[PDB]
């Protein structure tokens, strides 16, 4: 018979993005008090990643939950707070993300 292979169900990664004059190449969703992006999770998510853009080249994938940006935690953050964090993250945007499978 066959056996289920080793499966990674969850990841927490640290990704470093190099912003271009155009920007990061993502779109974020969610926030405390907002219509949650996934389920009831009012956290911040990556809803879009531009192909071969900075975030793309850095390992970001659609659906990543955004937990922290350059040492600024986003727990319980509203959408605009996360927006202001990223707008000012600067050239090098080091984000910690959470990632499921499937």
């Amino acid at each position: 018979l066959l056996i289920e292979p080793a499966r990674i169900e969850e990841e927490e990664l640290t990704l470093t993005i190099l912003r271009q004059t155009g920007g990061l190449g993502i779109s974020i969703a969610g926030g405390k008090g907002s219509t949650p992006y996934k389920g009831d999770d009012e956290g911040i998510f990556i809803s879009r990643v531009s192909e071969e853009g900075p975030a793309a080249r850095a390992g970001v994938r659609v659906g990543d939950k955004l937990l922290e940006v350059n040492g600024v935690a986003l727990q319980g953050a509203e959408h605009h707070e996360a927006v202001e964090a990223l707008r000012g993250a600067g050239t090098a945007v080091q984000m910690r993300v959470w990632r499921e499978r499937m």
Binding site: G23, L24, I26, S27, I28, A29, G30, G31, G33, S34, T35, Y37, S47, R48, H79, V83, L86, R87
Partner: peptide, 8 residues
Amino acid sequence: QEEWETVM
């Protein structure tokens, strides 16, 4: 309320 597409 629904803010799902703030592009950056």
